[PDB]
């Protein structure tokens, strides 16, 4: 019972998604840093 859960699925993130996420987070930081600081 405590063992193989049949709903276990792998999680993927290709390099395109990694670069999009990095760009999104860094651009959001660039945008909101001026407003958090002031």
């Amino acid at each position: 019972m405590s063992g193989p859960n049949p709903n276990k699925q792998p999680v993927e993130l290709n390099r395109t998604s990694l670069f999009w996420g990095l760009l999104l987070i860094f651009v959001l930081a660039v945008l909101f840093s001026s407003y958090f600081f002031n």
Binding site: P10, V11, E12, L13, S17, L18, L22, S33, F37, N38
Partner: protein
């Protein structure tokens, strides 16, 4: 002048999702490399 503890906000909000994405990418790449 510039309010403090906003350095923490900016840097942690930049790092944590970046950390999450880097971990996801490395995990996926190692799973692909072990699939071979």
């Amino acid at each position: 002048n510039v309010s403090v503890a906003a350095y923490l906000a900016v840097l942690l909000g930049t790092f944590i999702p970046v950390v999450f994405l880097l971990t996801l990418y490395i995990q996926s790449e190692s799973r692909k490399a072990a699939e071979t």
